[PDB]
Structure formats: structure tokens, C-alpha cells
Amino acid sequence: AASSLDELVALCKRRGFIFQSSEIYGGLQGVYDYGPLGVELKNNLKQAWWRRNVYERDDMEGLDASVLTHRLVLHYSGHEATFADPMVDNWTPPRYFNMMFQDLRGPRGGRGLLAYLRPETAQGIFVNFKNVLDATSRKLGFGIAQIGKAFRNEITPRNFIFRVREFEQMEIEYFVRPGEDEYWHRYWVEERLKWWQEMGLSRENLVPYQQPPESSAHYAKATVDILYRFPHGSLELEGIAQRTDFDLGSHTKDQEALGITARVLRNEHSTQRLAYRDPETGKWFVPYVIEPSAGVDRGVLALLAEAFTREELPNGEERIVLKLKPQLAPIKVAVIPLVKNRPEITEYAKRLKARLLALGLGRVLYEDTGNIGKAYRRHDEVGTPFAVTVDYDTIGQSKDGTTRLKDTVTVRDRDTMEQIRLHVDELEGFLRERLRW
Amino acid sequence: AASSLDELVALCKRRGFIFQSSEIYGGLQGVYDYGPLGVELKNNLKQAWWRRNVYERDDMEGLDASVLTHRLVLHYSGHEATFADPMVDWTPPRYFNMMFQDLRGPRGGRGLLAYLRPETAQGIFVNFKNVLDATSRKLGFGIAQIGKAFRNEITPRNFIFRVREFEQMEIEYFVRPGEDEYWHRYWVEERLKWWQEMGLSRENLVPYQQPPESSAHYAKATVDILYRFPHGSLELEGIAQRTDFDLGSHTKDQEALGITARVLRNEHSTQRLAYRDPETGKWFVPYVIEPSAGVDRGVLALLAEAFTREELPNGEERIVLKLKPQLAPIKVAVIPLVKNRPEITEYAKRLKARLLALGLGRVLYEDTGNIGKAYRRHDEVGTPFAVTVDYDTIGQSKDGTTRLKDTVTVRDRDTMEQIRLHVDELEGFLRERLRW
């Protein structure tokens, strides 16, 4: 585990995980960019999440909605009226600053040409309920998963990835029948909690907090936050709320014909009825929604934070090692040529990297950087699990003349630091064993 | 292949590929949303692209920059100026600027203005030094990236084509001033070749080499790959050659580095975006080759191409999306013959999981009524195989034999041929046909 927030910010910048967006012109404070190593880890996390909640389940439909949100969507969801914070200057009278990113479509800044950069992914889901329903012919006890970008017009962007203006989320909207709501809520909480550990976070660092009714927003019958023990303090990773029929409620047509339980605004615009019908009979009703929502960047940081570890070495000095779960490492194997000038060597290495990539266990990388020592260092810092290295013996140029050593390479374990030399054909099975899911 | 643009728009909406963003409130014309089936295909394409240009190569670094762009980036890249033009049509004296913009935090002050990037490339350019430092890369190398971009279109025409929000797959290949012309043709063959591997016919592809009149000033050459869509040729990808303009326009110590393209005096940049050590110690700004594709366009191209209407032996027709298997939103559909039977449904579900485990792509358990409707629904969304489970599969054959236990019928999308095989063979059957 890592001890300081800056150790991370430093590594992140130093090894190419994260960079201050627009750095060369002073930065656009509050927005960051993901480097070579960052994109990989980030994507690996998003994928593992998608595989788990969509592919592996049989009640989940996927989605990808746009960032440009029509003014109305955000009126009827309440944001226009409440997504704000209390602000002032130096002392003027106090007033709420609505934190949404607004931008005007086309020609003129007229009130009717205003649109928003969605501040959360969920509304995209809600407005498409009927749509999704029609096209898939889904029955109840079902949700819609989605990953995407969101923009919060924060006032003061604090410590790193935490208080940012642009970021990404992984949200699910699980539609449920009014009666069964309380069950599904605890079901999802165990599930998400469980997932995070499988990804590599320790139970000791996870904290399932249940919000007291003072904190619960009006339509939220209950909600639990999963916090992670970061170096600088506990920060929220994911939130599993229970929103009754508020969301579907606020956007649907024929509001008073469908017995809506949460208080909604009169909707004089919606063209479709977002409700479900046929509880064996013919009743229309608005489903209740359970909603797990995680923040991609937070997750990426949690993983780094957890993995980060400093080890003392027998000679006296230390080393930084990202102990990331293998399947999630930005790089799985690094193939390194002992000498940089030799062509039969580089050409072999490259031929080998490809053979390994073909196993389909994750990114294999051909490394041509000078100094076999620097390489090992660079890799432990970015958490890659294995390093295979190629030398003259591997080729067949043994100074003694035998070829008993042709096609064998040394593979160095990231964690144990143990190096063993094995023949290539065994190397495959070795890797399957250790890298498969 | 498909004959009309509306046939597609219709299928896309009908089967859950694409929907009009904000439809229930009148739509936010010009922006669309990707449904269950759409997200899948879209992602499948992005991935195949990433695997190819990053994993399979040894000179590529990946990236993911933010949409919120600082005002300055877009000043020095030229964009800001292309639209600082009072056009008086008498209608009022406007600025017909093509970028969405917005202001950061507290006030609408000029120093607090920001933009929603209109292209992904600038994110790459500004980080050149950064990426360089952290990776210790040598020349003959690029940076790949996928992301969102926003064009403040005035009139959103025909579907996916003239839209305000969309995504791109761009690469910035940094090259030494001398070798530029070579790399340019290299990339063109490569991209061209890729597109066909994805399933597009050579007959429908059109490599247009822009004549000196079209080329923006700093562009020493450029080729557009057009696709023959039902409504006409529309641009899929563009491989330009931008010399040292981009890196040039953003770097510090401009006149110390012999920049060849005309750039603006840059009084703000804090880093020097150049390369040094041509064996010696000379500094210079690399030339850039740039393949840039539009995700949505690609998705449409694939759909357009795959779309086909067939006349069947009984007399009726059918719509079949002939998508390349590895790209299909769904690889296998496991379907139960009767919906009420527990031994059947329970069997089928257990089977779908066994198949998903093969790691060949999404397998889906289908519980929709009517075995006929299912087959139809699937050919329409282009899923390659359909396995079906019945009473024989379980072991309740009305003839009394058990020779047919643990076997299922699998219907080929294309040939429509159905063969009944045992489950264990089924695996090998699928690997054969579905692997990359």
C-alpha cells in the first residue's frame, strides 16, 4: 500500500499514467489526461466491469448515450433546480451556483439554443427505457449498464483525480417491481463489494457506509457508499442507491394514470410512456430502480494506491513495485534483448513477443531501452508481472559451441524477483497458468 | 449490400443499434445514442483497431486526453482564427464559429473560456514531450488515441453524417524530416488494407488523392478513403502528411529549430516539442503522418455493406446482416424450444455459460416466444450461430430412445443449414469459425 498522495501523483506523472491536461500552457486545472500506461489500466478496468455485468449476466442490456443533453431532460430530472452548491466572494451576499456545464447550440446564445454537458450518465439510461424495452422485449428483473463521460462544473478542484471537472463513470440501472425493491438493493451491495475485492482491493480498506436519513436525498429510500481508504483519507468509490420510481417517474407521460410513489414534477413534454405493464394481469406501473454507480478514475487510483509498495533490498537500497493484479496490468510480459546493436537478437525478441501476444493473455511488449538494469526497474514501477530476456544462448551462439541452450530464455518474476531459465514451449503453459482469468 | 439509407435508419432504430438522442422531448437533432446492439458493434470495432495499431505494432504508444480544451491550444492550432469572421448575410453581424465552447467555473471572464475539442489530435500534439520523456522512444514512432469530438454544426443532415457529437480513431506518427514521403504511402496501404479485413469490399472503397488545390497549406499530401454509401460517397478516413506544422505551432524556441511550415509566433509554450540526437546532437521538429478515421462512419459502413435482402425457397424474403463474425454484437444465441419446460431452460442456461467460457465473444441466452421470431431477430442483428435446445437434448424423446441426449441443433446464419451435434464438438466447431 502507498503512504502519501504525492508519491502517487509523482509516479503517475513519472511513468506515464496520468498528466495534467494542457500542461504546456499552464494546465486546465481540474482536467487530466491518461498516458500510455494509464489508458491501458483504465481500459482493463472498464472491460473487466463490462464482462462481469453484461456478458456474465442474463438480465443486462448495454448502452452508450451522448454527452450533449437536451435542456429539458435536466429540467425534469431536477438538476436545473438543485444540482448546485452555496457560493460567495470578497463578502457578497451568498447564492447557489448551479454546477452544470452549459453550452449553446449553433447561431445565437438564445435561451432556446442552450444544451448541457451531462453531469452524470444515468439520464441517458432513463430516457431510453421505453426504447430499450421495445427493441429487446425484456421482462422485469432487468437492468441497463453503461460507461461514459460526465462533467461537473466544480468551483475548487482539489487534490488530483478527486475533485475534477471531466471524468468517467460505470453505472447500472436495475429496474425492479415496486414490491421487491428492498431485496435487490442488498443483493447489489454484496455483489459490487464482492467485485471490488476480486479486482484486488483488500477488505480492510473497503468501507460500506450506510447513509443516515438526513443525508438521503428525498426520493432515495436508502443508500450505501463504498469508500476506499486512500493515503489522504477515505474517498467514495461507488454508491448503490435505491431510487424508487423517481427517475422513470419524472420523465414519463400519463403520470397520474400510473400510481407514481415519489414526488415528481408535472411533465408536459414527454412523448412516450416509460412504464411497465402485465403483472400477470394488465396493470401499468412504474418500476423502482436500484443504482450502482462507480467512478472510473477513483477506481484506477484505488488500484494504484493499493498496489503501490516500497521494498527494502538485501544490498541496502529500496525499490518501488506496483503489485497490480496480473490480469489488469497495463503490460503482461516484457521481452527484453540483452544487447541493443545485435540484429539476430532484436529480430528474435520481436518474433517471440508476437508468439506470446498470440496466446491472448494480454499485452506483450518488446522493450529496446538501454541497460537491462533500467528495464527491470521501469517495469516493476509500472507493475508488469513478467520479464523475459533474450541473449546469445537463446539464439544459438553459445561461446562453447553447444546448442543445448538454443530457444531458452530467462523469465523474472515481478514480485519474487526470482529468475528461472526455461525453454520457450514451457513458457507458454507457465504463462497460461499465471495469467488466465 | 443495402439499397437505401432509410432501410438502415429503420433497422438501426428497430433492433437497437442507434436511437435519436433525447427522442422523448423532440430529439436533440444532430446527436444520437447507441443501443444494446450498437454499443457492442461499436466497441468491437474500436478494439480491433486498438489491437491492430498498438498491440500488434512496436512503435506505437496509446493515449486518452480530455475533451475540455484550454482556449490557447485551439488558438495556436489555427482553429480559433478560421471562424473569427463577421459574416453579414440584412441578418445580424455574426461569427459563424464551428466549435462548442464554455467557460470554466466562477465567471464568464475571457481568461476562463474553454472549448469542447473539435478533434482529438491536439491532445496528442501537446503531450509529445510528455510521452517522449516517459517512454524514452526513438523516432519512427506514433501515438494512437480514441475519443469524442464536437463540431458546432448548423444543419444536421442525414443521420450519422453531419452530427455534433461523435468519436474518432486517430494516430500521429512522428517521423524524421527526410523520410516523410515514404511513411505517408506506407500508412495509406495499411489503413486501406485494414478496412477490407474488417469486411468492406475493395469495390466500395475509393482512395482519393487530393489535388494541390484541396491540400491545406502545410499539407505536403493527403489521401481520403471514401465509402460507397447508398446515398453517395462519404469520407471514412483521411491520411494526411502535415510536415512539422503541428509540433511546430506548439513548441518553444521556434526560430532555434528550423521549422519548415509557416507557424504563429508562440509566446506561451513552456516546453520544447522537438527531437534531438541524429547520432550527433542536433535538435529538430519531426514531420507527422496522420491517419484519422470516424468511428460512427465505420460502424455505418459495416452495416451498409453487411445489409442484404434474400429471397427464400418458400417464396418470402429475409433481411440478414452479413457482419464479419468476430465483430457481431452477438456470437452465439442459445435458445430453448419450449418456454415452459424447466429441464430445458435450466439446461440451456448452463450451456450459454459453458460457451461464454470459451472466450470467443458474447453468447446470449434467448427466452423470447416463438422459435421462428428468434431466428428472424437474429439474422437481422447479424449473429452467426444459433444453438437450440429441445426435449431430445434433455432426454425426453417421444420415441423413447436416448441416442439424442446432450446434442443441440446449430443453425448457420448465412447458409441457414442446421446440423445437430454433441456439445463437446460444438466447442471445436466454434473455435474454428470464430477465432481471429
From Swiss-Prot, chain B:
Per its UniProt record, what PROSITE patterns does this chain match? AA_TRNA_LIGASE_II (PS50862)
Cellular component annotations (GO), alphabetically ordered? glycine-tRNA ligase complex
Kindly list the positions annotated as binding ATP: 151-153, 161-166, 235-236, 294-297
Q: Which GO terms describe its biological process?
A: glycyl-tRNA aminoacylation
Parts of the chain that traverse the membrane: none
| Gene Ontology molecular function, alphabetical | ATP binding; glycine binding; glycine-tRNA ligase activity; identical protein binding; magnesium ion binding; protein dimerization activity
Q: Which UniProt keywords apply?
A: Aminoacyl-tRNA synthetase, ATP-binding, Cytoplasm, Ligase, Nucleotide-binding, Protein biosynthesis
SUPFAM superfamilies linked to this entry: Class II aaRS ABD-related, Class II aaRS and biotin synthetases
Which coarse location class describes where this protein primarily resides?
Answer: cytoplasm
- Give the family, as the similarity comment puts it: Belongs to the class-II aminoacyl-tRNA synthetase family.
Query: What does the function comment of this entry state?
Result: Catalyzes the attachment of glycine to tRNA(Gly).
Q: Which NCBIfam families match?
A: glyS_dimeric, PRK04173.1
Q: What is the name of this protein?
A: Glycine--tRNA ligase
Gene for this chain: glyQS
